[PDB]
Each structure stands twice: as C-alpha cells, then as structure tokens.
XYZ file of C-alpha atoms in Angstrom:
208
model
C 0.050 0.004 -0.106
C 0.846 3.767 -0.070
C 4.127 4.439 2.205
C 5.016 8.067 1.382
C 3.502 10.240 4.148
C 5.044 13.610 3.084
C 2.235 16.321 2.789
C 0.142 14.508 5.536
C -0.998 15.855 8.726
C 0.105 13.836 11.700
C -0.731 13.451 15.397
C 1.016 11.697 18.280
C 1.915 11.666 21.874
C 5.228 13.095 22.960
C 7.062 12.532 26.273
C 9.620 14.891 27.699
C 11.641 13.570 30.267
C 9.440 11.733 32.976
C 6.463 14.309 32.460
C 2.987 13.380 31.152
C 2.403 12.390 27.600
C 0.949 15.400 25.575
C -0.580 15.596 22.047
C 1.623 17.089 19.058
C 0.134 17.904 15.697
C 1.925 18.898 12.631
C 2.617 18.674 8.672
C 5.140 16.265 7.371
C 7.383 18.530 4.906
C 10.003 15.869 3.812
C 11.510 12.271 3.994
C 15.443 12.555 3.821
C 16.855 10.670 0.970
C 20.328 9.736 2.733
C 17.997 8.443 5.632
C 14.606 7.430 5.002
C 13.573 6.479 8.379
C 14.430 10.605 8.995
C 11.326 12.960 8.593
C 11.185 16.901 8.789
C 8.061 18.363 10.299
C 6.703 21.581 10.877
C 4.524 21.260 14.423
C 1.642 23.657 15.001
C 3.413 26.310 17.639
C 7.010 25.439 17.176
C 8.956 27.747 15.053
C 11.976 25.522 14.523
C 11.689 22.696 11.993
C 12.162 19.206 13.664
C 13.961 16.058 12.385
C 12.464 12.825 13.813
C 12.383 9.144 13.035
C 8.659 9.076 13.670
C 8.420 5.436 13.473
C 11.321 4.773 15.869
C 11.713 7.362 18.322
C 11.275 6.319 21.976
C 9.623 9.729 22.980
C 6.767 9.214 20.186
C 3.652 7.079 20.872
C 0.131 6.614 19.209
C 1.256 8.243 15.800
C -1.670 8.463 13.242
C -1.238 9.799 9.657
C -4.318 11.228 7.822
C -4.579 10.156 4.337
C -5.784 13.758 3.228
C -2.714 15.124 1.569
C -2.126 19.003 2.089
C -2.206 20.487 -1.226
C 0.364 23.028 -2.411
C -1.407 26.689 -3.172
C -0.891 28.620 -6.407
C 2.658 30.606 -6.348
C 1.882 34.272 -7.350
C 4.701 35.946 -5.663
C 7.865 34.372 -7.281
C 9.040 37.723 -8.476
C 9.538 39.027 -4.820
C 10.763 35.562 -3.208
C 13.504 35.439 -5.734
C 15.002 38.877 -4.614
C 14.988 37.104 -1.162
C 16.255 33.449 -1.488
C 19.822 33.121 -0.528
C 20.349 36.468 0.858
C 21.401 37.901 4.450
C 18.427 39.645 5.853
C 17.544 41.453 9.412
C 14.322 40.159 10.860
C 12.332 42.255 13.491
C 10.642 40.624 16.280
C 8.585 42.089 19.114
C 9.862 41.495 22.657
C 7.457 41.024 25.734
C 9.000 43.988 27.656
C 8.133 46.839 25.203
C 9.301 46.399 21.638
C 11.988 46.153 18.865
C 14.424 43.225 18.535
C 16.419 42.748 15.215
C 17.858 39.274 14.387
C 20.497 38.969 11.516
C 19.915 35.958 9.448
C 19.802 34.180 5.920
C 16.658 33.031 3.902
C 17.589 29.774 2.511
C 14.618 28.448 0.431
C 10.898 28.366 0.038
C 9.730 25.408 2.324
C 8.244 22.247 0.661
C 4.570 21.590 0.992
C 3.604 24.602 3.015
C 4.939 26.823 0.262
C 3.953 30.244 1.519
C 6.774 29.650 4.391
C 10.370 30.224 3.933
C 13.374 28.223 5.500
C 15.438 30.587 7.474
C 18.552 30.600 9.880
C 19.991 33.213 12.575
C 23.333 34.307 13.417
C 22.486 33.990 17.122
C 20.643 30.596 16.710
C 22.146 28.583 13.637
C 19.473 25.960 13.462
C 16.296 25.843 10.858
C 13.234 28.193 11.249
C 10.311 28.579 9.085
C 8.245 31.858 8.883
C 5.763 33.421 6.393
C 8.547 36.018 5.386
C 6.745 37.771 2.449
C 3.784 38.819 4.983
C 6.549 39.765 7.482
C 7.964 42.011 4.545
C 4.683 43.744 3.837
C 4.417 44.604 7.485
C 7.917 46.276 7.309
C 9.642 43.775 9.597
C 12.087 42.194 7.242
C 15.162 43.807 5.394
C 16.931 42.104 2.567
C 20.563 42.780 2.191
C 22.359 42.979 -1.319
C 25.283 40.503 -1.730
C 28.758 41.795 -1.722
C 33.711 16.851 -6.989
C 32.295 14.428 -4.403
C 29.088 15.394 -2.902
C 29.001 15.899 0.790
C 25.377 15.277 1.137
C 25.160 11.995 2.865
C 28.522 11.802 4.633
C 28.992 11.467 8.402
C 30.348 14.504 10.327
C 31.601 15.130 13.691
C 33.009 18.250 15.614
C 34.929 18.437 18.906
C 33.143 19.940 21.722
C 34.979 22.108 24.491
C 34.470 19.395 27.073
C 36.549 16.933 25.051
C 33.487 14.831 23.519
C 32.838 14.393 19.835
C 29.368 15.108 18.507
C 28.190 12.782 15.575
C 25.817 13.365 12.839
C 25.257 13.437 9.017
C 24.866 15.976 6.384
C 21.304 15.699 5.141
C 20.880 18.815 2.535
C 22.842 21.416 0.367
C 21.178 24.691 -0.014
C 20.444 25.200 -3.905
C 20.792 28.946 -3.489
C 23.861 29.011 -1.511
C 25.757 25.636 -2.273
C 28.520 26.292 0.512
C 25.530 26.041 3.116
C 24.508 22.411 4.557
C 21.932 21.054 6.830
C 23.279 18.754 9.501
C 21.232 16.216 11.599
C 23.120 15.186 14.964
C 22.502 11.949 16.660
C 21.617 13.548 19.943
C 19.075 16.320 18.943
C 15.995 16.956 16.776
C 16.776 20.507 15.544
C 18.458 20.895 12.073
C 21.869 22.583 12.107
C 22.844 25.051 9.404
C 26.444 25.506 8.625
C 28.276 27.648 5.855
C 31.699 25.826 5.231
C 33.094 29.243 4.031
C 33.115 30.747 7.322
C 35.150 30.354 10.590
C 31.975 29.086 12.557
C 32.561 25.709 10.612
C 36.096 25.011 10.830
C 35.968 23.039 14.165
C 33.143 20.788 12.475
C 35.321 18.112 10.492
C 34.455 15.306 8.266
C 35.490 11.437 8.716
C-alpha cells in the first residue's frame, strides 16, 4: 500500500523526560533521501523545523497519519521571493517588555508542502526555522541585504566540543541557492543545524 507520508497531517503523543504524555500535531514536509527513517516536520506552535524518526523514536507514541494530503497552493509571488532567497536579512521581532529586536539571518529556500513559508537561519541561533517571510516583509519587519567533486550530502560528520567529547551526525541537505551552506542532523538532537563551510563558525566541524 501507500507508504509516502510527505504532505500528511500527523498527530502523536510526545513524552519529554518523566513528564506526562502530551499531544503534538503537525505537517510532514520531507523524508530525507540519505536516511529514509528521518522525516522533517513543521509542528503547530513550534518555529523550528524538527527532524524525527517518527516510527522509531522512544519519545513518540500513538502516531496517526491522515490520508488527506495537504495541497500546495498557487505561487503568485515568485518575483519577490527570488529577490530574497539566498540573501542575508535583518528580521524584526517584538519583545514582551516593550518592543524592537532585530535578528540577523539568511533566507535559505521556499519550504516544501507549506509553500507560503520559507526556511531561514539566524547568526544568534544557527538552526532551521520557518516563517511566512513575504507577509513579514509587507508589515515592514524584514530588510533584505544585497550580496557583496564528491557530494557532501550523505557523509558522516563530527566536531569536537569544548568538554573533549565528539558530537556525531550526518549532512542531510545542500542549499541550492547557496551551495556552501548545508543542513546537518546530529544523533543527539531534533533541531536541524545550518552551517556555511566558507565561514570560521564551521572549521572545528570536520568530516570522517
């Protein structure tokens, strides 16, 4: 029968530590070709994209996949998304105590399935996020800055931490609009880590 759940809405119990089991609901965005057990999900209420092995993870229970696949809507703003994809940006967020908070970042791609959302990462938090950036732009909260042989996708990666331990993981994606930028999935966490190999922030990070 049908085994591709990309595009489905899912629901499942989640158990954090020894706390109670709570329900999470979200949309499956992708299934990683170099690791078909790994799915990327946008959960309702979490800004970060999660990487979970939905059928194996010990913190997941009572998983249900709805057959009703989320349809991709008509794209009518490719003229403006093309000026933003692959660029450095300054994204404005509202703080609780008053206002104003600018975060420097980079727009990576239009998100798959939920295609009015974009993938973005920040210098202060270098993991994968999803926001409806063209709406934020219209509201005056996004500034777009002008710019000045073996494939690494699928390779194992590790980097030494300050306490002497090695953090293991795998490269799962190469950013089409900025090919020196990669997505890394580490064994110990569900966030997706974004690295630009041209920068000093990715020199400690080393391959095999």
